[PDB]
Design a protein around this ligand. Sequence first.
Ligand SMILES: Cc1cc2c(cc1C)N(C[C@H](O)[C@H](O)[C@H](O)COP(=O)(O)OP(=O)(O)OC[C@H]1O[C@@H](n3cnc4c(N)ncnc43)[C@H](O)[C@@H]1O)c1[nH]c(=O)[nH]c(=O)c1N2
Ligand SMILES: Cc1cc2c(cc1C)N(C[C@H](O)[C@H](O)[C@H](O)COP(=O)(O)OP(=O)(O)OC[C@H]1O[C@@H](n3cnc4c(N)ncnc43)[C@H](O)[C@@H]1O)c1[nH]c(=O)[nH]c(=O)c1N2
Ligand SMILES: Cc1cc2c(cc1C)N(C[C@H](O)[C@H](O)[C@H](O)COP(=O)(O)OP(=O)(O)OC[C@H]1O[C@@H](n3cnc4c(N)ncnc43)[C@H](O)[C@@H]1O)c1[nH]c(=O)[nH]c(=O)c1N2
Ligand SMILES: Cc1cc2c(cc1C)N(C[C@H](O)[C@H](O)[C@H](O)COP(=O)(O)OP(=O)(O)OC[C@H]1O[C@@H](n3cnc4c(N)ncnc43)[C@H](O)[C@@H]1O)c1[nH]c(=O)[nH]c(=O)c1N2
Ligand SMILES: NC(=O)c1ccc[n+]([C@@H]2O[C@H](COP(=O)([O-])OP(=O)(O)OC[C@H]3O[C@@H](n4cnc5c(N)ncnc54)[C@H](OP(=O)(O)O)[C@@H]3O)[C@@H](O)[C@H]2O)c1
Ligand SMILES: NC(=O)c1ccc[n+]([C@@H]2O[C@H](COP(=O)([O-])OP(=O)(O)OC[C@H]3O[C@@H](n4cnc5c(N)ncnc54)[C@H](OP(=O)(O)O)[C@@H]3O)[C@@H](O)[C@H]2O)c1
Ligand SMILES: NC(=O)c1ccc[n+]([C@@H]2O[C@H](COP(=O)([O-])OP(=O)(O)OC[C@H]3O[C@@H](n4cnc5c(N)ncnc54)[C@H](OP(=O)(O)O)[C@@H]3O)[C@@H](O)[C@H]2O)c1
Ligand SMILES: [Br-]
Ligand SMILES: [Br-]
Ligand SMILES: [Br-]
Ligand SMILES: [Br-]
Ligand SMILES: [Br-]
Ligand SMILES: [Br-]
Ligand SMILES: [Br-]
Ligand SMILES: [Br-]
Ligand SMILES: [Br-]
Ligand SMILES: [Br-]
Ligand SMILES: [Br-]
Ligand SMILES: [Br-]
Ligand SMILES: [Br-]
Ligand SMILES: [Br-]
Ligand SMILES: [Br-]
Ligand SMILES: [Br-]
Ligand SMILES: [Br-]
Ligand SMILES: [Br-]
Ligand SMILES: [Br-]
Ligand SMILES: [Br-]
Ligand SMILES: [Br-]
Ligand SMILES: [Br-]
Ligand SMILES: [Br-]
Ligand SMILES: [Br-]
Ligand SMILES: [Br-]
Ligand SMILES: [Br-]
Ligand SMILES: [Br-]
Ligand SMILES: [Br-]
Ligand SMILES: [Br-]
Ligand SMILES: [Br-]
Ligand SMILES: [Br-]
Ligand SMILES: [Br-]
Ligand SMILES: [Br-]
Ligand SMILES: [Br-]
Ligand SMILES: [Br-]
Lengths: 414, 414, 414, 414
Amino acid sequence: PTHDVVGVGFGPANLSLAVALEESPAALTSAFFERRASISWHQGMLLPAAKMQVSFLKDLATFRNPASRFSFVSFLHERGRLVRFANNHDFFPTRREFHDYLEWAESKLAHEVSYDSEVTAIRPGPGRPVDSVLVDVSTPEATRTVEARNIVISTGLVPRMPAGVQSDEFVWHSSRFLDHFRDRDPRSLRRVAVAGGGQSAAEIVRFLHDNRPDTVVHAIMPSYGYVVADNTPFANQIFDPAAVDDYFDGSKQAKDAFWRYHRNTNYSVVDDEVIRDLYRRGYDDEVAGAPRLNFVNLAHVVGAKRIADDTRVTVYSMAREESYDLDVDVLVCATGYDPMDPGDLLGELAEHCVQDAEGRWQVDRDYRMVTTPDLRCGIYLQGGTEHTHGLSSSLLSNLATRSGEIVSSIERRK
Amino acid sequence: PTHDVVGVGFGPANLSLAVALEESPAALTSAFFERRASISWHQGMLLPAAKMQVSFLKDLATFRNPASRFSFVSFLHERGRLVRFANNHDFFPTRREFHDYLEWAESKLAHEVSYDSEVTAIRPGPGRPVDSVLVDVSTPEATRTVEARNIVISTGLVPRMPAGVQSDEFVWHSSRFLDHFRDRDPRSLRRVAVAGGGQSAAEIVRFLHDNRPDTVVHAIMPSYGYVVADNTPFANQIFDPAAVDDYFDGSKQAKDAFWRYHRNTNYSVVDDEVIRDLYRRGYDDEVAGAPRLNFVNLAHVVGAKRIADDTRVTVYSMAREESYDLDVDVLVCATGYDPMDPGDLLGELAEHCVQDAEGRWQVDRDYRMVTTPDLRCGIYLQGGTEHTHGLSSSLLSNLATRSGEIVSSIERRK
Amino acid sequence: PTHDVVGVGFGPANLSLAVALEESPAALTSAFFERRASISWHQGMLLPAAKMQVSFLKDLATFRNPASRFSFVSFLHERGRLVRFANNHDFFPTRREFHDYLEWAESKLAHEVSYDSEVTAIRPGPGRPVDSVLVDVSTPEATRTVEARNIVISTGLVPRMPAGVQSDEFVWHSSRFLDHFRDRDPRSLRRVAVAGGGQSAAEIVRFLHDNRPDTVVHAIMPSYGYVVADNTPFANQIFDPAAVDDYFDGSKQAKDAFWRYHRNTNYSVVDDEVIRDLYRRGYDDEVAGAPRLNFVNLAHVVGAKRIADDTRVTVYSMAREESYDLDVDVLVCATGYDPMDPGDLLGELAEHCVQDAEGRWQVDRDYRMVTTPDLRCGIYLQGGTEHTHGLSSSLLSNLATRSGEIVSSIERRK
Amino acid sequence: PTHDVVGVGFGPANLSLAVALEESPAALTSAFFERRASISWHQGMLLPAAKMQVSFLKDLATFRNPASRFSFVSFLHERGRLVRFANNHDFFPTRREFHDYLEWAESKLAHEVSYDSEVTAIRPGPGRPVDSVLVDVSTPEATRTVEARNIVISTGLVPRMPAGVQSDEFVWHSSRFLDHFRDRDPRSLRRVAVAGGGQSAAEIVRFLHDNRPDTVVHAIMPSYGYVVADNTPFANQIFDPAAVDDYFDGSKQAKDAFWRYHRNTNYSVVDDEVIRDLYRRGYDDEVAGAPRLNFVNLAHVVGAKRIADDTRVTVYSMAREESYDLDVDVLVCATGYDPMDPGDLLGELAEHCVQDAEGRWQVDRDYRMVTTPDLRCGIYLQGGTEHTHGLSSSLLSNLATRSGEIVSSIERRK
Ligand SMILES: Cc1cc2c(cc1C)N(C[C@H](O)[C@H](O)[C@H](O)COP(=O)(O)OP(=O)(O)OC[C@H]1O[C@@H](n3cnc4c(N)ncnc43)[C@H](O)[C@@H]1O)c1[nH]c(=O)[nH]c(=O)c1N2
Ligand SMILES: Cc1cc2c(cc1C)N(C[C@H](O)[C@H](O)[C@H](O)COP(=O)(O)OP(=O)(O)OC[C@H]1O[C@@H](n3cnc4c(N)ncnc43)[C@H](O)[C@@H]1O)c1[nH]c(=O)[nH]c(=O)c1N2
Ligand SMILES: Cc1cc2c(cc1C)N(C[C@H](O)[C@H](O)[C@H](O)COP(=O)(O)OP(=O)(O)OC[C@H]1O[C@@H](n3cnc4c(N)ncnc43)[C@H](O)[C@@H]1O)c1[nH]c(=O)[nH]c(=O)c1N2
Ligand SMILES: Cc1cc2c(cc1C)N(C[C@H](O)[C@H](O)[C@H](O)COP(=O)(O)OP(=O)(O)OC[C@H]1O[C@@H](n3cnc4c(N)ncnc43)[C@H](O)[C@@H]1O)c1[nH]c(=O)[nH]c(=O)c1N2
Ligand SMILES: NC(=O)c1ccc[n+]([C@@H]2O[C@H](COP(=O)([O-])OP(=O)(O)OC[C@H]3O[C@@H](n4cnc5c(N)ncnc54)[C@H](OP(=O)(O)O)[C@@H]3O)[C@@H](O)[C@H]2O)c1
Ligand SMILES: NC(=O)c1ccc[n+]([C@@H]2O[C@H](COP(=O)([O-])OP(=O)(O)OC[C@H]3O[C@@H](n4cnc5c(N)ncnc54)[C@H](OP(=O)(O)O)[C@@H]3O)[C@@H](O)[C@H]2O)c1
Ligand SMILES: NC(=O)c1ccc[n+]([C@@H]2O[C@H](COP(=O)([O-])OP(=O)(O)OC[C@H]3O[C@@H](n4cnc5c(N)ncnc54)[C@H](OP(=O)(O)O)[C@@H]3O)[C@@H](O)[C@H]2O)c1
Ligand SMILES: [Br-]
Ligand SMILES: [Br-]
Ligand SMILES: [Br-]
Ligand SMILES: [Br-]
Ligand SMILES: [Br-]
Ligand SMILES: [Br-]
Ligand SMILES: [Br-]
Ligand SMILES: [Br-]
Ligand SMILES: [Br-]
Ligand SMILES: [Br-]
Ligand SMILES: [Br-]
Ligand SMILES: [Br-]
Ligand SMILES: [Br-]
Ligand SMILES: [Br-]
Ligand SMILES: [Br-]
Ligand SMILES: [Br-]
Ligand SMILES: [Br-]
Ligand SMILES: [Br-]
Ligand SMILES: [Br-]
Ligand SMILES: [Br-]
Ligand SMILES: [Br-]
Ligand SMILES: [Br-]
Ligand SMILES: [Br-]
Ligand SMILES: [Br-]
Ligand SMILES: [Br-]
Ligand SMILES: [Br-]
Ligand SMILES: [Br-]
Ligand SMILES: [Br-]
Ligand SMILES: [Br-]
Ligand SMILES: [Br-]
Ligand SMILES: [Br-]
Ligand SMILES: [Br-]
Ligand SMILES: [Br-]
Ligand SMILES: [Br-]
Ligand SMILES: [Br-]
């Protein structure tokens, strides 16, 4: 049994793909494999006040199909919370509500996703030219192989630790913050260092500040203060379907300009509202004569070691061009992520995939990897297209159109 | 040929009815009559900056059917403006865009509306009990009569001038502001009086101030300054479908409480942003040493007379308890509207319509007039239900659910 | 030793008076008596997030003297927080910071206030015409009498409980909320009823929601939902110095118009941001499937009784026109305040104070009670002038100008 | 006659110096020379809606002296506009009002400024050690020389045109926009090109769009849309007095970090509000079917030539890597400014001024140029300290403290 398309991973990207498949009149067979027991959308960072960074209109389908049964609005309606939501006049749902939306959409699908199923490799199917791929799937009990004419890789961002710092029992990456934080006896995390100046760093500091009154927090970041995230309307355009065209067709000089001017729309920046809230907290503590937030600016974390009952963080100060130590109970590294790497699961098939001068996967407009004539199977990327398709690659801005484009591509080639 | 339902008037209310009819699986025949040449939704007040007072999610259908082909979101999509609109992050479209939406929805309808068709009377059909009504329709060429088992009256708010003031060539009601303003020579309206403290009054003054630099404006209103419109989420809940029930099923005492506390959600009030804009304009003029906005507070317009080339406005000052005369080129009365009244159109049928103690029409929860057993035809009201259904009656807050309940009622009784 | 002026009470109003006295070139002797141990400015309601309802520019002096050593700006500067405050771009300080400001201003004063000193009576001095008043002061150790040519009564708002509800250990007035709440066992206040729809009611509910995850709260109020406080620039003009004149010189009809239209600037209303925050909390709880905020609208508390371990609150529902019982651990009545009344303190002197038709004190523009020729001493009111001077009487909007006018009046008559 | 200090230029910077001198108890003689007829603070860009980029609290003196007779608040009070201003709740005055403030402050000043007086050179005074400088002043009638022990150079930003483009009758720099625009016939500027993506560019485009309904505008900028200006509280800390020290004492690495992360607080960026307003304008035009704003992104103006009745603008597109022409009536270059440079004015004294490795002027913390032993006179810079003191150098953020430090330095050396 050969599937038209197999999806690796089941986060929002492949979920929108599943939705696109179901709404398409094309009869395409599919299977999706997710390593986790269920949809798990950055749960480590599902903090109490966390808000979506995108508008609810930017959901799984609406931009493609304004009357989708899978729209966020449909979700609200079924949950009897559309009227209440509209009264709030906030375009940005909470992360918690959105996570619910995902699970609701997944349930509504006719198709059934295979959970607890980790794709370990993707191999050339039999014959030349290669007309199918073999997908090696590991479940807790067994292992098996499924065959597919096309494959869509959507395995998500990859946590990035500072150079020279390894995650450990008292050194956490932000992605696994709540995982670790639930364990730990409250009276044992009185001193926390948080590395980073981005959205993750800010949210974690805010959470620590609100959730227990006596925690002392060291916010260590290279900038002089949080840099504001740019969500102004002209800016939000870089995420419009048509802007993806602009970026794709543009010269390397144009692509650079994109990053040079508009990297602030997403990377190493903090939403305006979160910034103000942190500032208000700092101000009120000063008034109360009880400072707890220590902003260590123009600095990086360059090392961590456990010494007795204290995690010793080595900080490099740019202002003084000197390193020094910082003893705390826990170091949380909110130091960001690396892009999805298409090459991960590809071994041999990577031989048939085409790189450019600088070594990067070549990708067609329809998110399909460029291959030699030895490969006729479609390898599509949702994620890992930062170089070719732009800033929207890892984000939720363009789920509907990207998924739709991929489905159409697959139908066209069938 | 007897129709299941005939709609009198084709503003947003009956348009949502037409949509509800089309989306309903029930096979109901219908005709709609509009006296104008086309949909004309308060065009006299389609000022440059005018913004909807209701969220785009409150459209013709979405609250009833979250995936309607007639949703505002569908409209944006077809116009290729959904992405752009979402980037704006504003829940409130312009009046101009919304007017487009209505025309777009009307065109989509399978059914064809009869324009240039004024309903002049509604009369008892033949027989007893009365099982149909006769609808007298006047077109430019002819007159005719069509028969219907149910009728839905939605003829809109009725302009209300101040007592003792009649509309005239230099005394206008706000509803016909642009109609009269586009005609006049700019250099002839250097002095304008605007009566009222509501949304209409404020928008007109703002428009006059922005449009031409030398117009002097007298803003005459009973309050000491504009009163802010309440659109905070809890007060807004009075427009929830469920709040209609609360109002309907509530005692007279409870109904009175709605008006006493929440009349400021709509009547005699001005949107926060419009108020601030006017204030900024006044401030900047003062700085420039060139005042043009004269706020005449705690006052009422009590008369107008044309004297040579001047419109003389008689103003009563509450502070002073005396009247005085104000000479301008034009008096614009933004003094509001009276509710729809099915009274005039009904004639003989009114005999079979039951009134309450205070002589008002009794109306069922499904918007259907209470009748004697002599009358079995449904007379539904969209508008004119302020006293039975509450503050949502004349507004856009509840189009989807009201229209849906009327359609269901008609189907149930068939 | 006869003082030119004696101040009864030392809240913000008399503090601004003290400041006005010191800044005036006039050499006037004074004494101030405060019953409490120190300045105590609604400490029972000093909740964590509470924000001033008035701009920092509306402080003790700035409107009168734009370069006062007692300005809020001077306070920030001395505290080394001015730059930090300006960066925040918020016109509204916290209540906690403002309380600090008051104490700071009090300390800076040359004059020394007499604390722990309750004024128990004000009596006619010796002679005719009565030329001085005698002020009976009770300290913890002794009692004494001081003599003054003028007296300024500023004893503040008086807590008002719902009719037929008396405060006790499980039935609190909002004014003493933190007094009772602190140290009460957390696990013993799992069910709280809060009566009222005003700023106090809203802040307490929000605090309860924020500070304890388990607490179930019943918000009981006569309106259908919180009514927004009007702070828009034009309505806010009623607090301008010149608007005091407009109100004072205006007819009874005009005065009524102020209250009819602009009572929503202060009474029985809630700040926009606090409303939205409560709504967001309610929404998120619904999403989480854990409702805790119960809004009991169109209702009022009509009785309370202690029954075993429960406080039984009798609620009257306007919608149903019936009464029912609600069991909670504590009833907090945030039911507002009555105006200051010089009546009690005055005794005999009241004979020489002229009343108008409705039993109310006549007051001159300069806040000086109207007296018979039998009395030449100045009795000034800061507070209790709602009926003569308007909505600014109990508020912080006009401290600088009122205090300045009182000082000037006293100097003029000397 | 030898002055303690001579100021070159009389914009806000030297105005604050004059104020600092006055308020200082030190008896220092001074003269100020301005080449214009009066204070002329970027009048070419005094557009109708233009708003200060800095809080009113950041005025001539307040941060140094919180009760200055020259504060913005004092200004408002004297103008009888303090109450009205506070009611507006806007920290940011209009540029128009601020310009008034400057003139008002100038008039208050006890000592008189010499207008129509252009400093043409600064020379070594006679003898050894060099204890004075000679200032060559050219008035319309005569020329003269004044002597001073110290000199403060504050001659402002210098307009910068694109490379290969020269200002002309139909090619304007933004700084002279209104100067040229008030002259031209309206019907002759139907096609305008505006180069730049900064605050100047945005304001001019907005003005052109609002002013006349039929102007077509080409907005040419290197970014893919306007980049938001960062004004959030933490990033704004870079303008704190203490942040000057951090920048000054910091390594080159640290200084680079300030620019790398926080350049977006001021350069090549646009205020949030202005961006949103432009976007709304674009949206409404599309709805109206009448587009007029053409955003030419990822592009640079590289040339301009007059050809008959057309200004032909050569545009380089980074996306296509090619150049093309656009014909308009006028090209406005809003392409920014170069820093103040004491270089030109200094001449021979420059020999006595020490440069660093990269050939830049070495400046002490007090703003005083580093000199050779023979030179004992103080040469202070207000402006032109970007490389030593940081991003505050050309701005209004720090007038009070900088001026105060310079005055103190002069007194201390005296
Ligand atoms: C805390 C936080 C919050 C947000 C965001 C990031 C972070 C860290 N993002 C960006 C983020 O990339 C986005 O929200 C989604 O996670 C992207 O969807 P994906 O399906 O592509 O990755 P995603 O990570 O969601 O899905 C990957 C899945 O594949 C599974 N998987 C990986 N390898 C596998 C294998 N070998 N076999 C089987 N399964 C495998 C993983 O288990 C995982 O479930 C965002 N962006 C935005 O625009 N707005 C927003 O609000 C947010 N919110
Ligand atoms: C300037 C302005 C702006 C707004 C609003 C009012 C005003 C004055 N409204 C309220 C307004 O009532 C609502 O928007 C609709 O007009 C109501 O729809 P009807 O369909 O009920 O009115 P209208 O929309 O008033 O429908 C009546 C129509 O029937 C026609 N008609 C009358 N008599 C007839 C006859 N005898 N025969 C045939 N046709 C006849 C009329 O010609 C008219 O077209 C509003 N509310 C809100 O909630 N949000 C908002 O943004 C606005 N905007
Ligand atoms: C929780 C809360 C918060 C606010 C406000 C009210 C409340 C309840 N207000 C209004 C409030 O009225 C105002 O802030 C001041 O309290 C009024 O000053 P007095 O100085 O007039 O009152 P208070 O400030 O009430 O002055 C009274 C003092 O006199 C003392 N006293 C009474 N009788 C005495 C006696 N016989 N002998 C000696 N001393 C006696 C009392 O002890 C007390 O210290 C307000 N308004 C606004 O415009 N903005 C705001 O932010 C707020 N904030
Ligand atoms: C349109 C616009 C608007 C703003 C700003 C810039 C621009 C272009 N700025 C920055 C701007 O640099 C600042 O507002 C002041 O102009 C700087 O003060 P200066 O006194 O140093 O220069 P400024 O240019 O104001 O004054 C210099 C003066 O010296 C005179 N002069 C020059 N050479 C001379 C000579 N040889 N002899 C005699 N006189 C001579 C000139 O005539 C001129 O009047 C700003 N920044 C901010 O933080 N907030 C804001 O709101 C603004 N607003
Ligand atoms: N509420 C939400 O929906 C939410 C929450 C969290 C994250 N997200 C999303 O997830 C994505 C990533 O955000 P992110 O904050 O996790 O990552 P991020 O944007 O890459 O931010 C990483 C930060 O850590 C800094 N850093 C790197 N090495 C460091 C070191 N050795 N010491 C100190 N700081 C160091 C980076 O500084 P430099 O770049 O200057 O080197 C940067 O400030 C974004 O798309 C974001 O929007 C969303
Ligand atoms: N942008 C939009 O979508 C828009 C624009 C305009 C209107 N509308 C809507 O249309 C409806 C009507 O609003 P409206 O502003 O036209 O009317 P309105 O709300 O009824 O207000 C009428 C005003 O005139 C005053 N008034 C009455 N008699 C007067 C007199 N003799 N002299 C001076 N003033 C007098 C009223 O004062 P009192 O009430 O105190 O007596 C009131 O302030 C509302 O639903 C509104 O939201 C919407
Ligand atoms: N309302 C106000 O108070 C107000 C008004 C206007 C200005 N200002 C102030 O004045 C100062 C300067 O602002 P500004 O906007 O005048 O200048 P600016 O910040 O320097 O911005 C100049 C812009 O022109 C661009 N540019 C450079 N060469 C170009 C070319 N050949 N073709 C097209 N575009 C080109 C720059 O792009 P790149 O830099 O990316 O190369 C940049 O976006 C700031 O302090 C600003 O805040 C204040
Ligand atoms: Br968005
Ligand atoms: Br719903
Ligand atoms: Br690193
Ligand atoms: Br560890
Ligand atoms: Br970890
Ligand atoms: Br949190
Ligand atoms: Br492009
Ligand atoms: Br540290
Ligand atoms: Br796409
Ligand atoms: Br698509
Ligand atoms: Br709404
Ligand atoms: Br679209
Ligand atoms: Br009319
Ligand atoms: Br307008
Ligand atoms: Br109810
Ligand atoms: Br309904
Ligand atoms: Br329905
Ligand atoms: Br205020
Ligand atoms: Br400070
Ligand atoms: Br109590
Ligand atoms: Br709180
Ligand atoms: Br619930
Ligand atoms: Br007063
Ligand atoms: Br005064
Ligand atoms: Br403008
Ligand atoms: Br600022
Ligand atoms: Br004033
Ligand atoms: Br250039
Ligand atoms: Br040039
Ligand atoms: Br030219
Ligand atoms: Br020029
Ligand atoms: Br530093
Ligand atoms: Br030519
Ligand atoms: Br400094
Ligand atoms: Br200083």
